[PDB]
Amino acid sequence: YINKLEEWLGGALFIAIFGILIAQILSRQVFHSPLIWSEELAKLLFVYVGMLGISVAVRKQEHVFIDFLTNLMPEKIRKFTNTFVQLLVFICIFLFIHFGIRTFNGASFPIDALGGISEKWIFAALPVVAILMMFRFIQAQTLNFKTGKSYLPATFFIISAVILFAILFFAPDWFKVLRISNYIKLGSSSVYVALLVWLIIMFIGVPVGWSLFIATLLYFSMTRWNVVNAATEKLVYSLDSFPLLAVPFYILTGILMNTGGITERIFNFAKALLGHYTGGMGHVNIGASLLFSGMSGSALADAGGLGQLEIKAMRDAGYDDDICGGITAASCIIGPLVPPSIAMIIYGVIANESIAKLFIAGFIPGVLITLALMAMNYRIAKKRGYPRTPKATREQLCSSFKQSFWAILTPLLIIGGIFSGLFSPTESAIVAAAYSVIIGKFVYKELTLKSLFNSCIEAMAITGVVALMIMTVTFFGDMIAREQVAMRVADVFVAVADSPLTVLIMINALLLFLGMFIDALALQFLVLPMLIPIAMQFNIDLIFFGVMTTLNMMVGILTPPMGMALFVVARVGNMSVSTVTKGVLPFLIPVFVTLVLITIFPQIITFVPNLLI
Amino acid sequence: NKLEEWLGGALFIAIFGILIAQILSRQVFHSPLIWSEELAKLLFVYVGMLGISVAVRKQEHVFIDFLTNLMPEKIRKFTNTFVQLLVFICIFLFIHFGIRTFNGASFPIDALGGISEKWIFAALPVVAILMMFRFIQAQTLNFKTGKSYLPATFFIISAVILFAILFFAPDWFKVLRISNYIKLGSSSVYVALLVWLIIMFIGVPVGWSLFIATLLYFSMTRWNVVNAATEKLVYSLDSFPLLAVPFYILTGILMNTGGITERIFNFAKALLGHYTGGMGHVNIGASLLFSGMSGSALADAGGLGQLEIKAMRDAGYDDDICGGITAASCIIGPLVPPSIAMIIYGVIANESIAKLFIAGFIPGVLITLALMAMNYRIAKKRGYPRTPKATREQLCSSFKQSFWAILTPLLIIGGIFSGLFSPTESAIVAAAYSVIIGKFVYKELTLKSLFNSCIEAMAITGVVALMIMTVTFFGDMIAREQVAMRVADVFVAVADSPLTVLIMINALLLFLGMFIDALALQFLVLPMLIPIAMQFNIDLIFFGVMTTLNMMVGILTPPMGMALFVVARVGNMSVSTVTKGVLPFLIPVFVTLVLITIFPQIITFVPNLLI
Ligand code: NA
Ligand code: NA
């Protein structure tokens, strides 16, 4: 029809990348005859895949935005706010089109190890998909206006776009009027003004992926506009990255492993293993979450794939509702810590750090979290005197292990690939996806071509949202580093640079405070760009800083009044949010304790990666 | 699966806008552009490819169905299987030739900032792959309905193995060259022509039969020449005069609205409705006025037929007379400019289109006058009654109602004749005026209707584009083998007078027009007669007008004619009565044709004086 054209085309390109990578590994490992074009071809296709994902997201209106202030507004103000955000997004898309055309015209360098092919093939992705994004925005405007959620029809946008394109193509010297330098010369306060405007527009519902672009454009307009052409290439260059390839494949691996059949087998094995100790079903839940974390890079999937079973088992065992909710909500944070992890990949991409070292560093805190949660569950259960389930016979344990053998072999594969160094994170993700597909198709007989295509489509759709923010934050970093914001901030914060512990304490406190009202995914892209240079200023190790920031932000999904884990657990378990929060409250002590422990003693985190690499 | 329709319609409106900027800048701003024509051609190539793909998907390519209508279904199974296999081979070779030609072309375009010709030449394999996919999709339904013995999976595996062999072992193809076994020699072209006639009469579409015939001839002698010959396949569509066809078709479709046609009929009835035999005069005049805009006879037959038939029946006419008049009055369309057939002839023979239009204007008027005289005589002899004469108020109201409708033919004719606009520019202006009138003046136009009209125009132009490219490919072999010189050496005895050649050609065309449709017959006949006509020092404009008239004659001849069937369908009467009523009206057409072929000066004088 006329909406699935990006999903039909994007899905086909996703399959092509999978076939190319699997051929690269087979040739190197088996035949010892490596290929020189696989990486470049994969990155070239991934650029288009990411652009198509962005188009899908902007069509479905699914871009991340802060809704804390938006949730406390009568609709009569929401109408004006939505009108403003629609205008801002339209302007951003038009400027994307202009900059993509210009940077495609400017591409000159050839691509070696690809037959001398010019770089215009890479650089042409931006305008062709920006046109589709503009079409999708115009299409969505009709639905927005018809229901009374905005003030402007799509005819207004069509007329404005036609007029703007005609002006841009027939007299581009008319746009020099709207330069702030022509009226007021702020000087060195341009960065502060741009950041203030960025915060103001971000707090009123504008998505971050456009807010960063708007802030950077305002800064450039204030000082000088001719320096934007040099910096605009980073938008295309950010997607042309090898480490960024692992995100969609890890997402697809999690999606494929999150079927009902595999989860039931894993939970049955865990229950047969840890079901008869003091605090049985709590230990069962913790163990199941730990096992799932080795193959899943997200916490919401773990929360939504096992809650209805773990909560029921705990209720049958003799557990109160608050305890069930607390354990279920607390056990979710293990996922993002144990590798693989989307948050660690994002931090490594932003800070230009090796993902493997981040994974190795973050492996230990997951084990510490698991042990602390198990100890707390045992103490609570012993205090309350809950009954003990009968011991399982050896035959049932053996049968459950035989059933779940191939399902549980995956985390071992991931850890062996990563720790031993035989594979890179992207190759590890590719191997994991191939193994999961084989297991689903031939061993469990629970997969179909339609299901595989739908999983690929979902992975691309969730990848596009991250891709837009990645490219925009890469654009924002140039503005941040050009004017030396971090150096000035450090100079202002004098007499506190004596001890790095004070800086770490302040950063942790700020992150904890901000995590109570902003979702983790948005908070990461909101706070990292201005903190990474500041951390670099104080000679703070970047691997330890990344681990600490990831843990601190993952803590924030458990604290009221805004926490996704609390809402998900309450919805799944059919219980009120207040009871879930009350049950969660006693379980926040171990996480704070381990956070303080790693903050005081960085050697715990730093020892393992140094020994291994 | 509207993937081609959605993308093709987007390109169609892009072409329309670019052409508009060309004429406006050149007229009032006096700042002509240097890239509008190049962009128009470059986009028209893709538009034609998309139309061909759509036609392949819908299985609507033209073919001869005379012998196919006289055989049992058992034979039809084998015939359809053979046709499917031949089309599959044609599409595969199409893909291969597109890839080779794209990998060969390197020349730049100086009129577009040095852009390489690869941009033009890459449109062949990209759309060829989509055509192959559409054929595979249609094969499933063909096998499901029981019309063929070959399922789709067989085609899939055959395509896979063929692609693998081509990419990894092209040298294995050296066993299918006829030069391996026997060297036919000079008679290779004759053998290829015999195979072409047979494969056409079997039921293969023309646009593929010509390709098969020329490929067989090339493989008969040397396969290394087809590499040089394959550039014409893409260069054929890269033509600016060819752009007039889709826009004229769109203009006709837009103007064929029921509201406009009702007003035109009302004005014609108020004007010429009271004379003896008034209804026939009204029918002829309305057909002439609508042919001033349209360029197809089928629109004339199917649009205004019911109202004219009802008016004639009310007046007290007979069924045979009304049917005959309605059928015979539809041939004025292709004669009066604009006309699709004249454009096709000009493209094939490389002749000016404005000269063709000017030359062909007069015979349409002669036909109209002859038909009016014949109708008047028949009505007077049969003693039909007379209608009262309308008063000045009715005629003035009709004029005020249909002013904007009758403006368009005069605008088009004035643009063509005065030399102010080229035929493509005239088509663009006509389309713009029609859409403006529809949207704002009469208020019966919607954006969805415009998109549907554009889709229909693209679908109907793809079929013509495929035949155009294939016939241009065929002409290469025809010219290389020196067929016309051999034919002249054979019929040296016929060269006594050019009148003998003309009457022989006319008789052959008249005999061939009783079984084949006008379009298929034209595409079969023109490539073989144009070089022969040039051989005998025969003028090409006069020959084109005469051939167009002779081909248009065949649509009113039994046992095959589209006009008879359409008139019978829309008139609720048997085909036999329609034929027996048409028969007395064929005399003026034959008389006009004989008069034209006797005095070519009648056709020749007007364009030379007008130029
Ligand atoms: Na994980
Ligand atoms: Na006409």
Residue numbers in the entry:
A (entry chain A): 3 to 615
B (entry chain B): 5 to 615
According to the publication:
Tripartite ATP-independent periplasmic (TRAP) transporters are secondary-active transporters that receive their substrates via a soluble-binding protein to move bioorganic acids across bacterial or archaeal cell membranes. SiaP delivers Neu5Ac to the SiaQM TRAP transporter, which uses a Na+ electrochemical gradient to drive transport. The SiaPQM system from H. influenzae has fused Q- and M-subunits and is one of the best characterised TRAP systems to date, with key functional and biophysical studies informing a putative transport mechanism driven by a Na+ gradient. We determined the homodimeric (2QM) structure of HiSiaQM using single-particle cryo-electron microscopy, the first structure of a fused TRAP transporter at near atomic resolution (2.99 Å, with local resolution extending to ~2.2 Å), which reveals new details of the transport mechanism.
Dimeric HiSiaQM exists either as a side-by-side parallel dimer where both monomers face the same way, or an antiparallel dimer where one monomer is rotated around the dimer interface 180° relative to the other. Dimerisation is mediated by the same interface in both of these structures but given that HiSiaP is found in the periplasm and SiaQM requires SiaP to function, the parallel dimer is almost certainly the physiologically relevant conformation. The maps are of high resolution (overall 2.99 Å for the antiparallel dimer and 3.36 Å for the parallel dimer, FSC = 0.143 criterion) with both extending to 2.2 Å at the core, allowing for accurate fitting of helices and (almost) all side chains. When refined using dimeric masks, the parallel dimer has slightly lower resolution at the dimer interface (scaffold region) compared to the antiparallel dimer. Local refinement of each monomer within the parallel dimer improved the resolution at the scaffold region, suggesting this is perhaps a relatively dynamic interface. The buried interface area is small (~200 Å2) for the antiparallel configuration, and even smaller (~100 Å2) for the parallel configuration. Further still, the parallel interface area is formed by a small number of residues at the N-termini, which have modest resolution. The predicted binding mode does allow two HiSiaP proteins to bind the parallel HiSiaQM dimer without significant steric clashes and each monomer has the same binding mode as the PpSiaPQM model. The parallel dimer is consistent with other elevator transporters, although the interface between the monomers is reduced. Even with a small interface, a dimeric HiSiaQM assembly may further stabilise the scaffold of the two monomeric units.
